[PDB]
Amino acid sequence: EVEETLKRLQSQKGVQGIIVVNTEGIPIKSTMDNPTTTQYASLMHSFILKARSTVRDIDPQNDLTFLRIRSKKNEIMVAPDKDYFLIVIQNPT
Amino acid sequence: EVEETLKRLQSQKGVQGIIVVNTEGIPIKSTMDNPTTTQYASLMHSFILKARSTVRDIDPQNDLTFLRIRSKKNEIMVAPDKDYFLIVIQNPT
Amino acid sequence: LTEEEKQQILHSEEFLSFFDHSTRIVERALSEQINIKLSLNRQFFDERWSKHRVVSCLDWSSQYPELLVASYNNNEDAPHEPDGVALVWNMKYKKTTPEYVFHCQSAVMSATFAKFHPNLVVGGTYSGQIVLWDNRSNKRTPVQRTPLSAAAHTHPVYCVNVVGTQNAHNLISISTDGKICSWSLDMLSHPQDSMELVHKQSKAVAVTSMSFPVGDVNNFVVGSEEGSVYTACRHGSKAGISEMFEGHQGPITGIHCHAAVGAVDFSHLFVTSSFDWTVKLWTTKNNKPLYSFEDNADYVYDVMWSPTHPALFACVDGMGRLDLWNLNNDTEVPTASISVEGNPALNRVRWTHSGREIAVGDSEGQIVIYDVGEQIAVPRNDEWARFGRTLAEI
Amino acid sequence: DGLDVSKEGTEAWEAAMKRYDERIDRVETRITARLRDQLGTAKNANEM
């Protein structure tokens, strides 16, 4: 399913915007607008590829299955396994 | 006090005291094997700087103090203040 | 840059914000959640180096609990084949062959790991020379060999070990003649300290067993071939035999002090194994053996305490069965007792330093690794109190 | 019975004793039955 998944992931905290990204970056889906979704998701994909390289540097068999950034102004969530790259925009709290 | 911070951080699970990495990529404190921690400290500095650039691309007023680098073996708690990058090795459970 | 200005910048007092950040991240990261019986354990039997060649002694490495040294002494199938072979067998991975193989010209019959050197194996042979084996070298011949002088041991030697702190070690070895001597683990060309054990004038001791108490190195207990156990002080004014014990009318085939710590001390207690199936749970403080467990027609060959259980210990038997006596559970029947196939004469038992597994010797060289149930292996906090109460019974 | 001096009290105590021994012999029968059903193995220790 698609719509039910997005609805349940959004309504759990009233998330500002989430799209499903089953491909390596460059997603065509949108939740508030095309640019802020697509370009930022591609940048997230690049940075999580770098983070995967970082976690493989210490030991190659390690993989990053969970990642969250909670700064003073936003919270970003992504749980990549092989191609499932999640995006969450949320207040820091 | 430095010793108070040492004893408070070592209380956390899977943490050997406290180790802090400066901007030059070397840990200001010595707690484990020096070459591995120095190389992986250069790596954390590299990708946290790239994450800082990434966030400043769209959020030029945000600051980075929280990151959950967790794998199937351990979680890494990297937290930069201005220069002193706080790093904690912690078991996921 | 270098590691000097970091000290002054740390002593510099701009660290209030850094401490606040550290406290905040630690307090936020405090919460942690999740994302989503006696058994034959293993076997060890060489064929090239274990055709017959009965087992003599075993040990576990303190630094590497996965390592065990075997010692096969007798050579009768062929004079040309190796006389004494020492085999080290690993626990981490299962192999049909020992991890390393060692030879001595004479018949190696007593061996132990080295505490100071984590890559060295020392063993005693039938000739009475102390035999070294540095695993770094690729040669099967002994690395360092003590001379066959009257100063050193000239009779067969059974008890060889290294004790003391990491910075203070002494290679205590005693032969059948009754002589004790210490050596430095790096230099064995000369005996650093040696004197023959002797009781009341003109009475030598036919030494065949010894065990240092946990912690203490200055005093210990020695098992004699004449069935009479003695306690000796390693160093001091009273260096020598200090206790006459009736023991048993059978020669002592093993001895061990208490091997548990954490509650009320029991190190004064010790276990002796005679030649007539008479094990004596018994303390050095008392002169009377506290109990005299008796059964069977055969007899023990060794008795070893549990490194973790203050009540359980293992026993050897000649017809191939290994029994466990948990005194708190019972004092009349072995708590666990099974027999290995082929009813062979087991000769050595050595508890793993973890205490979760027990190794046994054999009359044919096939080392059998035995695992035990969890309920019988780990003791409890009340186990020590129950052990004290049972001792207080008589 | 206690500090009672009457010898008829002693006879009543004797009746109490024979009833006590009736229970005692019942216990004897119980423990001997538990004995024999556990016997026949061998001579050593818990067997005999």
UniProtKB/Swiss-Prot annotation, chains A, B:
Gene field: DYNLRB1
Organism superkingdom: Eukaryota
InterPro entries to which the protein is assigned, alphabetical: DYNLRB1/2, Roadblock/LAMTOR2_dom
Naturally occurring in which organism (per UniProt): Homo sapiens (Human)
Family: Belongs to the GAMAD family.
Oligomeric form and interacting partners: Homodimer. The cytoplasmic dynein 1 complex consists of two catalytic heavy chains (HCs) and a number of non-catalytic subunits presented by intermediate chains (ICs), light intermediate chains (LICs) and light chains (LCs); the composition seems to vary in respect to the IC, LIC and LC composition. The heavy chain homodimer serves as a scaffold for the probable homodimeric assembly of the respective non-catalytic subunits. The ICs and LICs bind directly to the HC dimer and the LCs assemble on the IC dimer. Interacts with DYNLRB2. Interacts with DYNC1I1 and DYNC1I2.
Annotated GO biological process: microtubule-based movement; visual behavior
Chief localization: cytoplasm
Annotated Pfam families: Robl_LC7
Keyword terms: Acetylation, Cytoplasm, Cytoskeleton, Dynein, Microtubule, Motor protein, Transport
Gene Ontology molecular function, alphabetical: dynein intermediate chain binding; identical protein binding; microtubule motor activity
The UniProt record lists the keyword Transport: yes
Presence of the UniProt keyword Transport in the record: yes
Cellular component, GO annotation: centrosome; ciliary tip; cilium; cytoplasm; cytoplasmic dynein complex; dynein complex; membrane; microtubule
Expressed in which tissues: High expression in heart, liver, brain and pancreas; moderate in placenta, skeletal muscle and kidney; low in lung, prostate, testis, small intestine and colon. Isoform 1 expression is up-regulated in 64% hepatocellular carcinoma (HCC) patients.
Role description: Acts as one of several non-catalytic accessory components of the cytoplasmic dynein 1 complex that are thought to be involved in linking dynein to cargos and to adapter proteins that regulate dynein function. Cytoplasmic dynein 1 acts as a motor for the intracellular retrograde motility of vesicles and organelles along microtubules.
Protein name, as recorded: Dynein light chain roadblock-type 1
UniProt-annotated location(s): Cytoplasm, Cytoskeleton
UniProtKB/Swiss-Prot annotation, chain C:
Keyword Phosphoprotein: yes
WD repeats mapped onto the chain: 50-99, 103-143, 152-193, 202-242, 247-292, 295-335, 341-380
GO biological process, one term: transport along microtubule
Coiled coil: none
Record keywords, A-Z: Acetylation, Cytoplasm, Cytoskeleton, Disease variant, Dynein, Host-virus interaction, Intellectual disability, Microtubule, Motor protein, Phosphoprotein, Repeat, Transport, WD repeat
Top-rank taxon: Eukaryota
Record PTM text: Pyrophosphorylation by 5-diphosphoinositol pentakisphosphate (5-IP7) promotes interaction with DCTN1. Serine pyrophosphorylation is achieved by Mg(2+)-dependent, but enzyme independent transfer of a beta-phosphate from a inositol pyrophosphate to a pre-phosphorylated serine residue.
A GO term, aspect molecular function: microtubule motor activity
Cellular compartment(s): Cytoplasm, Cytoskeleton; Cytoplasm
One GO CC annotation: cytoplasmic dynein complex
Quaternary structure and partners: Homodimer. The cytoplasmic dynein 1 complex consists of two catalytic heavy chains (HCs) and a number of non-catalytic subunits presented by intermediate chains (ICs), light intermediate chains (LICs) and light chains (LCs); the composition seems to vary in respect to the IC, LIC and LC composition. The heavy chain homodimer serves as a scaffold for the probable homodimeric assembly of the respective non-catalytic subunits. The ICs and LICs bind directly to the HC dimer and the LCs assemble on the IC dimer. Interacts with DYNLT3. Interacts with DYNLT1. (Microbial infection) Interacts with human adenovirus 5 hexon protein; this interaction probably allows virus intracellular transport.
Family: Belongs to the dynein intermediate chain family.
Protein name per the record: Cytoplasmic dynein 1 intermediate chain 2
Organism: Homo sapiens
Lineage: Eukaryota, Metazoa, Chordata, Craniata, Vertebrata
From Swiss-Prot, chain D:
Localisation: Cytoplasm, Cytoskeleton
Positions in coiled-coil regions: 10-33
Highest taxon above the source species: Eukaryota
Oligomeric form and interacting partners: Homodimer. The cytoplasmic dynein 1 complex consists of two catalytic heavy chains (HCs) and a number of non-catalytic subunits presented by intermediate chains (ICs), light intermediate chains (LICs) and light chains (LCs); the composition seems to vary in respect to the IC, LIC and LC composition. The heavy chain homodimer serves as a scaffold for the probable homodimeric assembly of the respective non-catalytic subunits. The ICs and LICs bind directly to the HC dimer and dynein LCs assemble on the IC dimer. Interacts with DYNC1LI1; DYNC1LI1 and DYNC1LI2 bind mutually exclusive to DYNC1H1.
Function according to Swiss-Prot or TrEMBL: Cytoplasmic dynein 1 acts as a motor for the intracellular retrograde motility of vesicles and organelles along microtubules. Dynein has ATPase activity; the force-producing power stroke is thought to occur on release of ADP. Plays a role in mitotic spindle assembly and metaphase plate congression.
Family designation: Belongs to the dynein heavy chain family.
Disease connection: Charcot-Marie-Tooth disease, axonal, type 2O: An axonal form of Charcot-Marie-Tooth disease, a disorder of the peripheral nervous system, characterized by progressive weakness and atrophy, initially of the peroneal muscles and later of the distal muscles of the arms. Charcot-Marie-Tooth disease is classified in two main groups on the basis of electrophysiologic properties and histopathology: primary peripheral demyelinating neuropathies (designated CMT1 when they are dominantly inherited) and primary peripheral axonal neuropathies (CMT2).
Name this polypeptide is given: Cytoplasmic dynein 1 heavy chain 1
Organism: Homo sapiens
